Amino acid sequence: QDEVIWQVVGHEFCSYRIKGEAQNFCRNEYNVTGLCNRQSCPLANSRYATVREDNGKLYLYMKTIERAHFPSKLWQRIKLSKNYAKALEQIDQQLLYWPGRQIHRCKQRLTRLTQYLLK
């Protein structure tokens, strides 16, 4: 079923997919890499995590297989407002067991957002 979703949305129309002439960018509000791919596909992965920026505050999102039918409680929010290091250990801790290799990607994403926040 998760593969059905990817075969429907990945290669064709998707509101978070931005195809230009040779490449795919994924702006989806719950992705980390920024690119379109099942491994990183937020909608087609039932267990997946992300970080995004908001008003000087970092946010980590997670979602599971249990709450798929209820979009309202489907995604889970946590807020971060501390320095980078501690913000790193939070993602490390929150993901040392959950995604598999998203730990490094969201460390990279948290990196870029904190440079945004200082600027």
Binding site: S15, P71, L74
Partner: protein
């Protein structure tokens, strides 16, 4: 251009019904709704059913 060009086109009724059932099934998947462009990030459940 002529008026007797073929404007209307035939689909087998069984294949029309196949597509209708497939679209209803697609409406029951939250991921497809978000992908198509619906702002359902806050709705309680899919399918969203309200009282009579």
């Amino acid at each position: 251009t002529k008026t007797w060009r073929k404007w209307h086109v035939k689909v087998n009724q069984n294949e029309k019904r196949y597509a209708i059932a497939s679209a209803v099934a697609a409406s029951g998947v939250p991921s497809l709704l978000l992908a198509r462009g619906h702002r359902i990030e806050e709705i309680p459940e899919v399918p969203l059913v309200v009282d009579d």
